[model samples]
Target: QKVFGITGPVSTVGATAAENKLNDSLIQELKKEGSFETEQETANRVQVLKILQELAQRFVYEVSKKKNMSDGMARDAGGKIFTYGSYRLGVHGPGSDIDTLVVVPKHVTREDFFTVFDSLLRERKELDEIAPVPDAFVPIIKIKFSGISIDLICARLDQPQVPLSLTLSDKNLLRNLDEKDLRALNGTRVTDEILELVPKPNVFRIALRAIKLWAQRRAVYANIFGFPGGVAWAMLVARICQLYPNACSAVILNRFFIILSEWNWPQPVILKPIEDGPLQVRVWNPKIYAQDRSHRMPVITPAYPSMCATHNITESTKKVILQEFVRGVQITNDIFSNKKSWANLFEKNDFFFRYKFYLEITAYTRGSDEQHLKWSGLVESKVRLLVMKLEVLAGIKIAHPFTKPFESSYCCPTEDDYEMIQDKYGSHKTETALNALKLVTDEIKDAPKAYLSTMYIGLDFNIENKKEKVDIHIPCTEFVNLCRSFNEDYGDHKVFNLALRFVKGYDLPDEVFDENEKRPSKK
Candidate 1:
């Protein structure tokens, strides 16, 4: 009842029903005990669009007047396009980021770019209110400009502007995916299939952010646990992100704190039976002496979902709330001045590599065969897309050692085993990475599935036996382009090599190619 929030009863009823149904699928598939879905997704999407449309209009007006930035890129001034990101992609909950794009004429200079950006940010009251750490209290950039967190990213226009092909490029970060690799990030599919199975968006995002912050601190020596560094922390975040919806990427803190706080006090661990399944608890808890959790390390991280809860929001509205929270001195002090990375501060000191592969699998119970197949296809497609991308574009070295899957006889993995993953691999894979591409396959092949008594394990060795590999990550720009490729070719299959073509010198070795061709044929 009160859970429905501002949207009145009838609408709330449908929304809650839909959310509950979705949750049923998620809980069933993940073998978790509880799940709920919302019927308000359409309304939520409509509200987000309204917010984005307004943000875009403001940008359009600013460009036409040439009043905000030094040299505005109006369509007349060679500016040709505008597109949306998380908000448009339909992945945002309330108060989420409205990622906007601006296409410039071939003639726009870099100096003019920031100048235009600076001006637009300064002039518009909405855009002017978003203040990052280095900037002052006013922020048109990342604040509630027309009630949304808007990020304006500029791109160069070549011709008939296509929202599908535009790419975001950064030059240096290492990655395992390319354009084709991105095909798995089907926003619509993500919207349709996974959202139902996860927590309400802000709660999800906040939980992810919290967990990531904790892992990152430990990995980088920023937390009390012995440091494991970037890869491990990133892997853990990715694992949780993959298991849940994208927006829930913010919820790591919620679950982490829920786990930690309860463990710290040890109040019977609240083991409720699965609502419809055979299991007794929604989540599996593995602890020898729950009282010992007091020795556990402390993670200082902001929970994005909790932030949403604090502000009383549900969908994209959470983004605005976050932006407002970020506008404060405490947030700024916690971010830029604190020397945290963009990956962290952007989500309130919680982030993971956009597509790190560590994950866990669970059996889907409630869905019909068709529904199960649909979900499975989506999951496998994501995995296959990543694997194929590695074979074709990700030149990172991979391994296929001929050893037993798990050396130990115990079939079930304890929470301690999950904990060891962070310690051993530093993120996801339990092996050293000679090539980041290899890391992707290793994590997936080794992903554990939780059940009543065991964490499932098996290896996909057909692809691993091959020797051919390619370097998928060339530069930061290439990585962003890869992301664009995925967004553009969600249903289309041919665009798989979008990221592969960017490698100027990297190529698949002949021996590897020869072996790869034969093995697949043999299979």
Candidate 2:
């Protein structure tokens, strides 16, 4: 028997065998890479969940009781915990953290959750490396629970009691909540919505897991850097599942690359048709909404008061995404022809060494660790703006931004030199700055924990004009002004003290490339 999608050799050998082999091979690879969790890990996750639930319940009860309510009344006012992201979608890997949200009643304030519940988690023997980030865009507590990292956030709804059995599917649950709470609840709602919208959950999950792994390997996985996040990836896969309802994971996988590669930009990828909601909050409406129109790659959320999940995407990021999609299409076609393995599709990003010049953004704080986190977050989020600014500059062909930021410490000779460096460049720390002078004198003892963040942009010079020497000074100066403008707007104390450096690929130390196995070929 021959099939339309099956190739000649596979068709001759039997389509069933081919499909079975593909499925088995995919599963085997996933397991071998520790993508699939062991049974004990599963049990441990359950135990962690139970413990979180108990903590929420106890906190709620105690808060109510402190207000002089009866013991029974306090116990009746329940609190809930829900999971989202990969863990919630059942595609979490062995080392993946559980993305959790704790829903509490109106009586239990967010401050209370951060303070009281945070203390409670810190007291647990199973918890370690507990970090309660209250100033985050969406405040979260990141902790390692019995070897598993868990990113937990809180959402306090405007209700007297938040029962443990309460479901977030009801959109009305979001009413009267602050923006932070709305964001926190939206994660669970959007995740649940995707699961509901899919034609085949199991098929979608497998394909998504494969795609996620591939995205991570290819370096186009991070949402912060303008690439599609886990949710966006899930929705894209789910949309494919909807189109081919009866198709196998392998077919869906093939079609995913094909569909995206052919997909038109600025046009959104949405699962469900957008509907009007009761909320006053603005939804993703490109037609009439001016702000929404600026979104480069819009992956709309299916939940009520839906938002564009890929709003962070910039011109450079959009180009990067499309280029990867084209590559994916070619690789998948090779797989179909039996010329390449699944591993080929997941090859390390060759974008790193593919260029000559790069812009590095270094953000740091001399204050508290929490301040560094907040400042770095703000800086990372604005990197797309910097990419957009660089895109329009002369003699620049492609400004490819690496989504991940690296952390390192830079040594300065004296406070005066550091201040001078900061004054001259409007920031401190550069390859030239450190390598030329400061690094020769090593006094590692007094070097404060200065957090380092690096974002690289691969540049393409204009060869047609025969411009042997490219002047990046104007663009670099403009970028410094853009960063310094932050101090004027947000105040120096609010914004993180930053450093900017532009270095050619060849100028970087060889040691930087030593640990990176996937550094792209310069040739």
Top TM-score model: 2
RMSD of 1: 24.1
Candidate 2: which stretches are off by over 4 Å? Answer: 1-16, 364-371, 410-413, 416-451, 464-472, 487-499, 514-523
Candidate 2: what lDDT? 0.75
Off by over 4 Å in 1: 1-96, 110-128, 132-140, 157-523
TM-score of each: 0.25, 0.87
User: When superposed on Cα atoms, how far off is each prediction in RMSD?
Assistant: 24.1, 5.4
